[PDB]
Design a protein around this ligand. Structure first.
Ligand code: NAG
Ligand code: NAG
Length: 49
């Protein structure tokens, strides 16, 4: 629904590049880090691999 990126990206088509949701973890299991370049969708607890 929204993201705050400090790079030059096309905000009209940026929201369809969210990180892949693998499981229930930190950042849907995509990064295992502190932050991701883009926020994962909020409902990654129900829809993930
Ligand atoms: C996420 O999935 C795991 C199964 O791998 C489950 O044990 C856990 O309770 C789930 N978390 C939520 C918030 O649904
Ligand atoms: C994320 O924050 C925690 C808080 O202490 C820190 O330990 C960790 O190093 C941070 N992650 C990265 C990638 O720096």
């Amino acid at each position: 629904l929204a993201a705050n990126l400090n790079e030059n990206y096309d905000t009209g088509t940026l929201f369809s590049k969210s990180p892949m949701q693998w499981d229930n973890s930190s950042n849907a299991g995509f990064s295992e880090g502190n932050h991701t370049w883009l926020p994962t969708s909020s409902d990654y607890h129900t829809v993930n691999v």
